[PDB]
Structures are given as C-alpha cells and as structure tokens.
Amino acid sequence: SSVSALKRLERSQWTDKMDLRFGFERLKEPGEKTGWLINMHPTEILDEDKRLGSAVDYYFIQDDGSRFKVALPYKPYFYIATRKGCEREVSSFLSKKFQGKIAKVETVPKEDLDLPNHLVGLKRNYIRLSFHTVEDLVKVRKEISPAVKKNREQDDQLDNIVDMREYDVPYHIRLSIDLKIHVAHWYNVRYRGNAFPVEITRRDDLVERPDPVVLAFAIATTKLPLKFPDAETDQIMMISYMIDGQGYLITNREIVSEDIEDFEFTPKPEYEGPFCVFNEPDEAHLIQRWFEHVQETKPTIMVTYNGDFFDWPFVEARAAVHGLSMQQEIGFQKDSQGEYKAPQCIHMDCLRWVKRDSYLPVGSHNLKAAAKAKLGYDPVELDPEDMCRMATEQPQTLATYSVSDAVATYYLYMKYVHPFIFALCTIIPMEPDEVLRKGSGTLCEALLMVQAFHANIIFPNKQEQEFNKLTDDGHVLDSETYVGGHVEALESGVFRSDIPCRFRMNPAAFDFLLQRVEKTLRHALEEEEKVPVEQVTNFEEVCDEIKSKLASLKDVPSRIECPLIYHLDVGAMYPNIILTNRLQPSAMVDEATCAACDFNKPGANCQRKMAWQWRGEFMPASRSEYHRIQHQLESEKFPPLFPEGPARAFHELSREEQAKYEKRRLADYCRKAYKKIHITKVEERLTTICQRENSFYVDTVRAFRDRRYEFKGLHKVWKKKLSAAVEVGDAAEVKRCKNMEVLYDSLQLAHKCILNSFYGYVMRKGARWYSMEMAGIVCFTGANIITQARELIEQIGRPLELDTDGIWCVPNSFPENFVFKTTNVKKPKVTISYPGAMLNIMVKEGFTNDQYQELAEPSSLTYVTRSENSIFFEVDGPYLAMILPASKEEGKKLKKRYAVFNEDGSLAELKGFEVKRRGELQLIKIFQSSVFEAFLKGSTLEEVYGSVAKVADYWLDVLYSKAANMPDSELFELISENRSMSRKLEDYGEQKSTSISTAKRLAEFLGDQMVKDAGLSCRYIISRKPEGSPVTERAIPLAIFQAEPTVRKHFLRKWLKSSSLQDFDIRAILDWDYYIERLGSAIQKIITIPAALQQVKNPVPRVKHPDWLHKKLLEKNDVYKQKKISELFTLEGRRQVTMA
Amino acid sequence: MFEARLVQGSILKKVLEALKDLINEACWDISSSGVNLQSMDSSHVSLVQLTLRSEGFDTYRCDRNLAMGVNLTSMSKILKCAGNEDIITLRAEDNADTLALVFEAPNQEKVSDYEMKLMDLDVEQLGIPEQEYSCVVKMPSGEFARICRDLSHIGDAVVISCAKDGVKFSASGELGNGNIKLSQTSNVDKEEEAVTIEMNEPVQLTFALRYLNFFTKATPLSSTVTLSMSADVPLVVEYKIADMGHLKYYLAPKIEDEEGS
Amino acid sequence: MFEARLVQGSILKKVLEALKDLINEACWDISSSGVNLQSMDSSHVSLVQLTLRSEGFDTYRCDRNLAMGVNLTSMSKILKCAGNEDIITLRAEDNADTLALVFEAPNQEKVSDYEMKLMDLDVEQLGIPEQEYSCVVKMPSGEFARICRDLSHIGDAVVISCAKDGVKFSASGELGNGNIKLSQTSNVDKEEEAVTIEMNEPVQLTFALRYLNFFTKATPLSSTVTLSMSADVPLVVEYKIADMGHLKYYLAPKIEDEEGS
Amino acid sequence: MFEARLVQGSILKKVLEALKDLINEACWDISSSGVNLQSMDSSHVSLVQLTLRSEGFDTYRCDRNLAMGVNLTSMSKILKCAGNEDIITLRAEDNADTLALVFEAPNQEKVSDYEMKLMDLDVEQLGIPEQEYSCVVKMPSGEFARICRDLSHIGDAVVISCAKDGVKFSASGELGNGNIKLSQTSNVDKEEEAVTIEMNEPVQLTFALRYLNFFTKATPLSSTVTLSMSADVPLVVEYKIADMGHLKYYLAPKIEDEEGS
DNA sequence: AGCAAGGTGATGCTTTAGATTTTTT
DNA sequence: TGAAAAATCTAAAGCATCACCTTGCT
Ligand code: SF4
C-alpha cells in the first residue's frame, strides 16, 4: 500500500522534473494564460488533503515560443445497474463497505439504447461511483466484476448489482469525453490556486496553428555482413537529425575514415536541409553530443521512421552499455506495449501512418517507396551489405545516405502526417501519439463515445466473444459470419478506346431507356445539381438529342464499336447506405422486444424489412447430443493443463480451453457418428430496422459527411486563393492562405478517413457497437446495387469487372455528357453525365427509403416521415485503357488485379500487381514494369498483342541463350532470390524449406556464427546438377562465388552430389528450367491467357497454354454457340403443376 | 388412384437411373393411355419424353389424369434400394402425399414398402408434332454406348454424318480428332447385333456430346436403340424397352453461324 | 514369448478388417483360455468384444497373462500380405515392445516375417452383464448388409419392430419413409440362409445407423448374424468366427430425447 | 512411310498403363530391327526400355531409320479405346505431324481411325553397356507385384540381400520393419511358376521402394520376371514373354552417403 | 468372366492463425 | 532482430470431390 504510493510519488516527481528541464513549467501562479494543446498525460498530483489523487497534465505551447503545463484533477468513475426498489440500499452499502475508497456515489437517470419501449422516453436510473485514483478504479472494478459475471451467467448485496458499464474507458479519454478538451485547439487556462480547480475554455477566434519544435532523427550503424545489426555486438557509427529545417550530423571517428564538412542536401527546391557536422572521437562522445544537443534544443516532438522497434532500442542499449542511461537524460522508455514514449514530448514514427492512412499498396510501406510516392523524389539507394565498407573507402556516400534518410523522414512528417494527425485528433479525443498508434476502430469508438456522451446515453460494453454458441435449430456453431461481397473479373484481356469491341445488346432495355429520358434529366437536375427545371432553355433540345442517339442505336442492337471504359463507383457507398436506411447498432430489432413498445400500431410505418445473407459453419449435432456430451464430460475431472498445478475442477479452468476441448471431443465423435463433420449453411435472413430509433449514430455519420463536404468546399476556395497568392507573390498572405489550405485539406482528409472507418468499426470483433446484422445488410445492399448495375450495363454493353465498391464497365455512339444553359447568374452552365444519371434514377426507383422517420419535436412524440436517398454513382471518365489479367482461381479468394491507363497515357490506377521487395526475382519485376507500358502500343488488337509480347520474347531470348551476352554482376542481381530468417534455425526442428536449406549451407560453409543469432539474410539461386531432389534441396547460396577458389570447388563438389564435372561457372550449374517455368507463368498470367480468352492466336509460341485453358475455352467462350430446344421446336405453353 | 404391377423389376430401375443423371426436375403424368414424362433439364439444352403404355403392366387401372412433380435430384436412390428381379407395385393415392411402392422377392419372403413424397415445381411444356422422318440408324445399345464413351475423351462436340457408304461419328479438340465409320450389315441374321439405316439425303451435322454421355445410361435396358436426325431437326435417341414401353431423348442441334452474311 | 500358429489365415484378415475402421486403439487381453479383446471407440458409444478360444488354433504355446497396447491401423495395414488360405503365426517376446507375424504359403515357398513396434495403452475395463434377452434373431449376413446399405441414405436412424409376425426395419428422413419386413422362414432344408426369430415380447427399438454400417463390415467373416436386443438394452450384433470364437458388437440405442427446443 | 499391324493389341495397352504414371512423354525410334524405346524418366534417375522387334509385330513395313517423340498423356488414354482382343493398324508418315491409327474389332464390321499431333524432342542418349551380373533370379511376376505392394507401406527404401540360402527383402519405417524370405523350388513342372537362381557372390544393395511400386504395374504384361544384380551396378528387372519379347528397366541404386560423415 | 462400389490416391477450393512474404540496417 | 504494433498475406491443415479395378459371385 504505502510502498506503491511512494513509488507513484517518486515517478510523478521524476516526470515533473523532466518536464521542467525541457521548458514545461508547472503553472504555480494565480493568473490567466492562452495556449495550444500539444499533449495530455494521466499523472498523480497532490491536493490540500495531501492524499492520493489522480489528475491529467495538459501541456500547452504559446505562439511567442514559451511553453507551460497545467494539472487538473478529476475523479474517474463508472456505472452500475441494480434492480428497482433497492437502489439507495445498494448505494449505502457500497459507500459503507468501500470506506475511504469511493469519493462520491449518486444515482444518475440515463437513457439506455437497448431498453425495450425506450422511444417514448423511458430512462434507467444508473449509479455513478467515482474514485480518487485510477488504481482504485481498477481494484474496485476487479472486485465487482465476479459478482456481475455470476449474475449475468445465472440468468450479500452484490446480487442486486445486475449489470456494469464503462470499465474499459481510459482515464485521459474519460477527461476528453467529459470536458471536451481535444488537442490542437487554443485555450484559456485560468489558475486561481490550489483551492479552486483550474478553468480551461476553448477559443474559436484564433484558428492559426503554432509551430512546435520538432526533431527528426535517423541512425546508420555498423553491420556484420549477411547479419542484421545486433545491439549487443555493434555500435552506432553515425546519426543525423533535423530540427525545424536545420540539419545536424554526428559521426563516430573510430569507424569513419576522413572528416566530412558542412554541406547542404536539396532533393527538390521545396526541401532544404543545411547540415552542420560534429565529429566525436568515440561512440560514448557521440551519445553525449546527441543527448546534450537534444537537451539544449528542447523539442516537444520527436519523430523517426520505425524507431520504436529499430532506431530507439539500439540507442538505449548503447547508452546503457556506456553507463549513462537514456531514460534519465532524454526521457524515453519501453513502457508496456513495446512503445518508446516520453512524458514530455510526443514520439511519432511515420510507419504507422504509412500503414494506416496513406492508402499505399502493401509492400510499398518502405520509406524509399513512400517518399517516392508522397514527397515525389526517390532517395539515394545503398544496400546495407556494402554499407560497412563505406566507413573506410569514402564516407561521403554514407553521409549523403544518412542526411537523405533524415530529410525524407522529416519532410514526410512535416508535409503529410503532422496536419493529418493534428486535424484528426481535434475530432478523436485521444493523444496525438495514441491516435497514431492504434487502428481506426478505436478512433471511431472514441468518436462515438463523444457523440454518445453528448446524447446522454450509456455506453455498451465491448463485445465479448461467445464460445460455441448454439444456433436456432440447436447445432453448435464453430463459425458464424455474413456473406460479404467479393471481386470477380467478368472478362480478361485488353480493352482500349482505339480497338473496336463486339457489342450484343437487347432493345428491350432501349425501350426502358427511351420514355424515361425526360424523368432521367429531371431527376438529375432536381437534387443532384439543385437547379429548378423551369429556368433552363435547351431541355427539349437535349431530350430530342438523346432520343435521336438512342434511336440511331435502336435499329442496330448488335454492332462493333469502340469502347468507353467507365468506372461507375458509388461515392462512399457504405456510409450512404447507413444514412439512407438508418442502420444503427440498436436499430435491428426482433419481435420479442419490437412488440413491447407503444409504436407497434396497425398501419404504423416504422419497421423496415431488409434482407441479408448469413453464412454459418456448424457441427451436425442436436441439442440433446451436445447436452449429453457435456454430461459425459462432467463425469470426469479435467487433466492439468500446465505442470504448475493439480487437476482442474469445474470452476478452475477457463471458458476458452474448455470450449476448445469440447470442440475437439465433439469433432472426433461426429467424425464417426455422422457423414459430414462441418455443415456449411448459407441462408437468407431478414431483419427489421427501427426507423424512429435514437439517432445519434446516423446524425454523427451525416454531420461528418456534411462537414467533409464543407471542408472540401473551403479547401477549394482556399486553393484558389493560394493560386492567386502565388500569382501576385506577396509574403504574409501567401503563408496565411497556405496554412489555411493545408488546415482544410488535412481536416477533410481526416473526415474522409473517419467516414471510411465507420463501416469497418461495426464488424470489428469486440467493438462496443458491434453488429453482424449491419455488416450483412450493407454488404447485401451494396451487392444488390452492383448486381442491378450489372444487369443495366450488361444489357447495353460489357461489364469488364465487378469490384466491391463499383463497376468497371463499357459504345462509341452512346451518350456521354451534356451541357445545359441556365438563366441563373451563379451557374450559367450545368454539365451532366447520362451514364451517371441513369444509374441515379435506377437507385432512385430501387433503394429510396420512403419511410425515413425523424423526431421533429420531443414534446408530443411527433415523427416526420421523409423520403431520403443519398446513394449516388460517380463516373470516372472515359479511361483510355484497361488491362485485366487471368488467374487460375475463381471464387471469393480472387484478388483485385488490373491496370487502368488515363487518356493522356499515364497510369490512372494499378491494382494487384504489388511487386515484392525481396520475395520475387528481379526478372519478374522488370518484365511486369515493361509489359504494362507495352500494352499501349499498336493499332488493332493483334498489333497490341504482338507488340506487348516483345517483352516476353526479349526475356525468353535472354534466358534461352544462357545469358551469353550478360555481365556477371547483373546476372546475379537479376537471378538471385533474397530471403530472411525470422527466428532461430534450430527451433524449427526438421522441416523442409529453401531458406532452411541455404541457411544450413551457409552454416556448414563458415561456422555456426551465421546461426548464433537470428535474423539471417540469405541470397540464393537454384542449381540443376542434383537431379531428382526437390526444389528446396537445390538452394546453393551466393557467398560461395566470392570466396577463395578451393572452398568453392570443395563445396560445389559436395553439394551437387557429383565428383566428375569439369566446368564450375555460373552458366553451367544454373537451373534454367525453374526460371523459364516462373517467367512463363508470369507470361501466362499477363500476355498469353488473356490473348487466348480473346480469340487471338498465341503471341509467344515458346509458352504453351495450360490444360485448364484448353478446357475452359471450349466450355465457356467458343467460336460457336450452342442452341436450345425452344428455338427449334414447338412450345405447348406454361402450366403450373401443383400438388394433387 | 393408380395401380402399376411389374413382374421383373430390372427395367424400371434401369429407366430411373437413365433419368437420374441429366434430369433434376420431372413431372410424372398418368392418364388413360399410360404414364408419360415430358421434362426439360435446368441447363436448357436437352429434353426427355418417356412413355409406358397401359398394356405393359400386369394389373393397371387409372381413374383420371394426375400430375406428380417428383424431383430426380436425389430420387432414384430409393428405387436403387431394391433387387433385380423383384416384383414392383406402384400405388398412387388421390390426394395424399404418399406414393406407395411394394417390392416382393421371388421366394415370397422378403417384402418391402417404401413411400414417396411430393411437392410443388414449375415446368414448361412442349408438345411433340409428328413429321416426315429422314435419317434413321438402328444400332445395338452397347455399341452406341461404347462409341459415345470412346469419343467423350476426344472432345465435347460430336459430328454426325450420314452418306452412301454408311454413317460416321466424329469429334475434335486440342488432343486431336477422331472419326468412326459404320456400314450396313449384309450377311448376318440375328436382329440384336445387326445395324440398319433409313436415308433420304446425305446429312452432315453437329451435336453436343456430354449430353450423349448422359443419354447412354441405358445399356442393359435394351439390346436395340435407334438414332434419328434430320437437317435443322433435334437429334432424338429412341430406346424401346422390350414390348413394354419407349423412351425419347431430344438434343438440340449445332450448326455454323453465318455472322458475315 | 507367445507362439500361436493356425492353418487358416483368412479369418484373421476378416476379423482385423472388420475391426479396422471402427476402433483405432485397442487393448488385447492375452491369457491361457485364448485371446480376448474388449474396447470402445473414441465416441464412447460402440463397444466391441472379441473372443478367440484356444481349441481352434492349430499349435498353441502360452506362458502367462499379457497386457497389449496395439493400435489396429498398424497390423490392419500389415496383414494385406497374407494370402487366401495361408498359414498364420503370431509371436511375442517375454519383455520386448515388438510383435512378430509369420506368414507361410501353402506350398512352403513364400515366407513372410514382419514385426512391429508398440505403445503403452490405458483402457477402462467394462465387463458385460449376463441377462436374458427377449428378441434374438438369426439372419443371413448378406441380406443384412444389403438392407443396411439400402437404408443408409434413406435416413439417419432406424426403428426396429420385433413381433411374432417378424421383424420390421423402418426409417424416415428427408427422402420420405420406408420399412422392410422379414417374416419367419421354416420351409427350408439348409440353415446358412435360414432366418429364424425367437421372441419373448414384441419390442420397439431405435438405433443410429452409422454404427450399424460400421458393424456390417464383418460380412465375409461369417455367413450368419445374430441380433440380440430388449427394452433399454444395447444391440448385440454377434458373428461366429468358425466353431472357435465369437465377435460381439454392443450398441447403445439412440434415444434422441428432445426437450421441445 | 511407316506401317504396322498388330492383333494382340492388349500388350501395348498394358505397356502404356505401366508407363502412364512415370514418364509423361518419351522417345521412340524405328529401324529395320524394329521399334525401341530407350528413355530416361522425368526425375532423371533410371533407364527404361521397350524392345518391340520386327518379327514380334504381325506386319511391319518401315522405309528409313527414324525417331519420334510421342506424349504418353494422350496416347495412353486414347489406347483405352480397346478391350482385350481388338486389332490395331499404325502409320507414321514422313513429313506429317499427324500420326494415323485404325482400329478394327474382330467382328469384321467395326473400323475406326484417329489422328495424333506430335512435338519435337531433345533428349540426350545414354550409352548401353553390357556387364555381368552376379545374382540372377527368375520368379513369377504375381508374387513380385504382391511383395512390392506389401512392402510399399513400410517405408521409403528397400534392402535386397542375395545369399546362399536364397533371396531376402527388407524394409523399415515408423510403423515398423519387416523382412521377407524366398527360397528355391525345383519340383514343379511349370516354368512360368518356377523360381530359379544363379549366384557368384552374395549381394547386398539398397534401393528406392515407391519407385519399384510405380514400376510394378507391368505385372499383367508377363507372368515371369527376372532380376539381375551385383555390387555397385544398377539392378536390371525384365519381363520376358513366351511369344513377345522383353521389357527391361535399369535402376540406379541409392546414393548411400553418410550425412554425419 | 465383368458387376457393387468404394477407397485410398490425387486435386481443387476454404481457412485461420501466426510466421514472413513487412518495417528498420 | 524483436514484433504484435497491425492489419494484409499465405501456407499448412481442412474438407469436398473424382476415379477405376480390386474382394465375392452371378
Ligand atoms: S420498428 Fe416500430 S414497433 Fe419496432 S421497435 Fe421501432 S418503433 Fe417499436
């Protein structure tokens, strides 16, 4: 008790001292200051009672440069629920038994969201209880929780407590929920003294953000060859860090060769780094120089790239070896989750944002690719293998590498993640670093807690996963999910606006799209442009123009015409569906509690019956079987799970291990008792959305959509103002408008990310607002929209690909866009898209919710019904080209792989072709990079294929000629496979892999030193001489080819299992068949199979089609067309054969 | 109510396993002329018309026409639960859901009673006109089944040509191509082995072959079969179940597409 | 150091193949009286007793009692080497964890000497009770195999009705329902196909039929099968291994007492 | 031009059934002495040869020395057309990719023709040495197939020991280890059933086992197999027919390398 | 002398946890 | 080289499906 309290006080005093030494002076005078919030940290303070007290320390920076720090105490609390009639008795008992532990307890009437008949205004009297410390919170929560769990499983005064809420809410989160203190806002802080609490108020008059002191650092180490840099055997050889655009660089003189002078790095004119260099003799002096310079500069933001796992720990280890610890001199520690965070400065690494919010493909998360994509320049390339050699030959290239990595991480912080994270966290109530760490689900949960505290409801607990729940007919479900939509390629090949395509159309859809043209244009003008249809001049002209186009297209339903590659993408389809259908996590209701309210009247327009599709896997055992196997299980005692205890009683082991044991013991019974072991049922369910539910979720999503729209508008206005500013060329207004423009761009980006995260939050396992029903409903409504669009474009053209978000689809005579002259002075011209408008009226007829009820006033419980449909399509222009490859696998595991080329000839988009950083040959990567730019040559289809097969011809000519005209170094740079070893080689046991084989070859080549520590890097080729042995067993390494000749000859004698060969050159022993096989597979994926599926002869004759192609082409896409009985034989008619 | 009696029960098992493979939706129709089946497959390519008349059964009585919508997705197995030569009795009730099947062993010891349930299915009906025939080729069933299984490995499309020399069955594909020519019999007197042909004009035409593979599950049903084709006329395969009943398989033809003209 | 040799070797293959798929881990009780094998499945439902008395062996040599832990997959795969009518021999050491099996061809030319390792096994013994049964029936094994394979896909569980008129095999499922009735056969001169029924009172039992399909696998072992059952009594499916031994499958009847959801 | 006529066409089907699982495309050459197939398998471990000589065929007509490469994956499955008595006409043209087959049943009515598409082949020729073998054993092929199939499940390798007592096989694996003894019988009147030996010194060898299982599918081709082996030589296994010639396999032994040393 | 049919060998489509294909050098 | 941090991969385990000639015998 006392020992923990004194340790907590010691930690608080140390954090206060460390805060003071970097400028964050604790506010100890009565007065008022203004500030900008930079961080917030749950601490302990002392009050006038000199007792335990929890608080939050808010750090502010002022515009003049000075910084301060204030502490505000607020007692954390949670909520209990008890049965009616004994609330006061439970309150009195809980006060008198937790004597000196509960600060205050009181009954709060708060509105349940899941309560039956809660829409009239029923409210439940919860009990708030608050504690002085977070540790007291945790202890009392742990003491109450067994009683709550026992009561909630069976259905003293602890039996009266039936339910318990708000226990996983963090403390600083709780403060930012209550007092509405989000960071990156300006505040007045008024400190009267220790008696009255501090007063903090928001200031909306100042909008301009200040500039905090930021330090971006990177290190270059000493690396043992073919081994990852270890902390205990190496040392830092140089460190480079930027502060506010000023460079600094410290080099270790015991490792480097000659001195380096002050120099500038400038990749682009907008990126300027002047680096001044200090040259410390030994590594301890390097650490002392870095620590002293950080202490002198006093930064409140420390940023790196993947520092938490590589940059930060290495420096901590080297500081701890050399005596002076890193925590006492800077402030960083590993904390608990492996996160290096300080109590005085926010630590950010750009890798978390690159993974989460950059929307970069997987495999492009490295800082080289991320800086090429975002910043627009490629940094300098230097492989770490020959990096230790640069410490001696010349250190100029290594200095350039380190300063380049520092510039990259600094400007990737300053340009992208700084305004994004400090605009995202004005919304989410977390800390800036906390927003950076965790996934979007917890951000969305925190936001919904803001909006649900504003609505005065209580927060549902996190979704505890039930283990093996029994479905409605009694079977034990070992898998339960919703049928989500997938991607499928309806046609594979090249589709270019120049090459004509064959269109087979029906004219029934042309009658569908002829008399409805006037309604099409009226609907497209009514709310999509908000233009009344009376002030137009050429309405009848454009209507008769569409009639003439569709009548010219009418008489020829089958034609050969040029395509118009469109991307009908619905504009954030899933939040639009949630807004349209009013899907809330408590809106899905069942008749057991839907009938218990007072609005289930005859003729009530309140329900919405919406269908979804459910997917379950379950054992084929009934209720009686599962009950009897439980009764057989309870007749015997469980074995000890671990050898640190005796056999387990029924209250001893936990739920998950007994659930796994029951799963196994039912599986090995139904293996021999029933034919099937896992029955999969994909059924069609239907649930009722309550359309007059408490609307905090829906108006949160709608307010965020509206705020995204208004921030996009402000961003466009300020972008125009910025263009005018850089045209006139002033100084103050240019920087002011640049600051405003980046503020609004960051805010709309944050709103877009949150809008995308709302859909992903509900399906998250363990989410507070968890809904499998919403996931199924939104996926089925999205799939229904994609299906009806598939029918609508499939009848008038060819849908190339069906994605989960939209349709890539396709005639040259089809109407594209039309301009309307309007008498309005604000919009003289209106540009409208007919393919967008026809889908708009299709979803207007189909998915418009005509029963969308909103509470107009809460006095007489009056609900207004309205017709709302915000689901709109978007046409992404007539793209020049689209290339779809073909894959062996068809189903839900198909990958979204295609390449779409803009009209100007660039790369509009490219998906699925993510080249792996080391897991692929260089041959495959260069072949792909050439073939994609090669598709756009030629005029007709055969010229396209014969000009895109030149890449395959060239590389098959290189590999068929044994690379006889190839230099040796690039032959190894192209052929070789790089690969890693994640953990210990010997711990795997005796299992076969090519990494295992080459690791064993390297171990027997040069000692056990290459296996002594993990993280081995292996570069290997595959040889042909040991015929018969598998692919793994022929993985000779590459370190042999640079070694002395005698050991190379000895181990090539040994490994090839031969002692009679003469030539030991690389061309002689190389397994060319493997490389031909994999390059031919890539050719088949990209060039050959799409040419076969387009009635085109094989462009590369050396690569042969697979047999499944030769059966699929005959069974699906033949030159002929199979007939039907009804075409060539008489029909008697349709009759209904009912049961007699 | 309807009664059917059959002394040796192999042939009903054989026709039902013939109808198993290609048919999922079936509609038995009973009238004064016997039992009839007019069924269209779910793939919308082929057709089947089966008929067992009144005099084939031993004891038979039909009050009026009744339609039963059986489902041959999983139905022939309950008949597959029987022996070979067992006496089979069908009992159809006026409005009850149970079709009764009685199986009697030849030693009058092993009896068996089965019931069949019915439900509601929808079907398109196609009336069969009678028209001047043209290309008839009568063959043994075993030879036709063997040649169909033979050509099944070559490709999925079959070429049928009748000419003065005889008849020719062919297929083609990536593996290659294969033709087989059969001429008329001259110096043989046994009826079940000889082949014969009726011709009006030499005809070259194409059909599908997987559906013919589904047609050839009637090898022990009868020793005789006839193939019947004509220009722009669906190929009908006729099995004559002794002097007891008959069965028609209709298959849609396959011609070239004159897209350019 | 157990040594036994028998002139016939097919019956060991038949017994072991019958015991192959049903049980995996088995405890072979070895004593002077013969070979005993009582065990259960991993599902703890099907029980097997197997007795091979010493008077049927050709040459026998025993030392004392032995506890054995053989998994039956091992020898069930080994004994595919034994011929149609070869000489079988099993050999065990006094204190070794291996078993030797010796196969002699009838012409004394092909000699096969296999041996195999072991694993320690623990089995909870369950001795059967001796009580008088009501329904004891002796049937041919082939027709029992036929009717079980017929009813296997008809439903899941069978209902057996025993009365003085005979036995009734009823089943109901998604395909409908059906029953097979077998009566007494007295007018017969031979016994190996003669069905006979012995009765105390009419009974109505229900059994899960997957376990009957597992029990059916002993069809070539014996030409007759004896089913013994009463109310709340496990089914006893007894086969007689020649005049020397007997194999009994005990099956807990499936009660399926639903609680009305 | 190349013409061949064969009336015992089942042996070619047996050859392709034996070789369908080992090599996917092989090499044939035609000369005045007949057809030879001397090819390396896919894993490049051992040599196989067919010797289909001139007078073994019923009618042979060859014009010049030639070599062709025929994929087994198509011709093996198209030779499934025949039963056990059909007769085969084979033609290989001079400069035509198509290879022609005609197929006559013995009923003098059935005639068929097929065409094959060929591909180029580049396989290095390995020289054929004639070396003496110390131990030659000649045993019926049925027991050879049985012993290989019965040692198939023991492990991945086999041990052969030829000693003055006779021949011993051995195998080992996780389920156990077993050896097999074969002696000599010299009091039988059938040479096809008789085993015989000739020995110079005892032989100890180790060999692949599943690969011998793969080459024990040529058992219906011939009733007697001869095995010849000695120290540090490939084992020769041959099936010789009383009328037709010999099928021969050279199998290289295992590496026999001490991994520790 | 081939049928009932199925059964173990092959083959193709889910699936679900953690290593790996991912960061840092 | 440690890592769950974190959500996208992906490869071993999973399970459904095809396939014909081999144990009794008509
Ligand atoms: S849908 Fe209507 S009846 Fe159902 S809970 Fe909502 S208001 Fe009540």
JSON list of C-alpha atoms and ligand atoms in Angstrom, two decimals, chain A residues 119 594 597 599-600 606-607 690 692, ligand 1:
[
{"chain": "A", "resi": 119, "resn": "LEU", "atom": "CA", "xyz": [-38.54, 5.54, -27.60]},
{"chain": "A", "resi": 594, "resn": "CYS", "atom": "CA", "xyz": [-40.23, -4.83, -31.06]},
{"chain": "A", "resi": 597, "resn": "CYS", "atom": "CA", "xyz": [-43.07, -0.71, -27.31]},
{"chain": "A", "resi": 599, "resn": "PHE", "atom": "CA", "xyz": [-45.46, 2.33, -31.60]},
{"chain": "A", "resi": 600, "resn": "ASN", "atom": "CA", "xyz": [-46.38, -1.12, -32.98]},
{"chain": "A", "resi": 606, "resn": "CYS", "atom": "CA", "xyz": [-41.99, 2.36, -38.51]},
{"chain": "A", "resi": 607, "resn": "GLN", "atom": "CA", "xyz": [-40.48, -1.04, -39.39]},
{"chain": "A", "resi": 690, "resn": "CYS", "atom": "CA", "xyz": [-36.41, 0.53, -36.37]},
{"chain": "A", "resi": 692, "resn": "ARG", "atom": "CA", "xyz": [-37.55, 6.01, -35.20]},
{"chain": "G", "resi": 1, "resn": "SF4", "atom": "S1", "xyz": [-39.78, -0.59, -35.52]},
{"chain": "G", "resi": 1, "resn": "SF4", "atom": "FE1", "xyz": [-41.68, 0.30, -34.64]},
{"chain": "G", "resi": 1, "resn": "SF4", "atom": "S2", "xyz": [-42.52, -1.38, -33.34]},
{"chain": "G", "resi": 1, "resn": "SF4", "atom": "FE2", "xyz": [-40.36, -1.93, -33.78]},
{"chain": "G", "resi": 1, "resn": "SF4", "atom": "S3", "xyz": [-39.19, -1.08, -32.01]},
{"chain": "G", "resi": 1, "resn": "SF4", "atom": "FE3", "xyz": [-39.15, 0.52, -33.63]},
{"chain": "G", "resi": 1, "resn": "SF4", "atom": "S4", "xyz": [-40.95, 1.84, -33.14]},
{"chain": "G", "resi": 1, "resn": "SF4", "atom": "FE4", "xyz": [-41.24, -0.09, -31.97]}
]
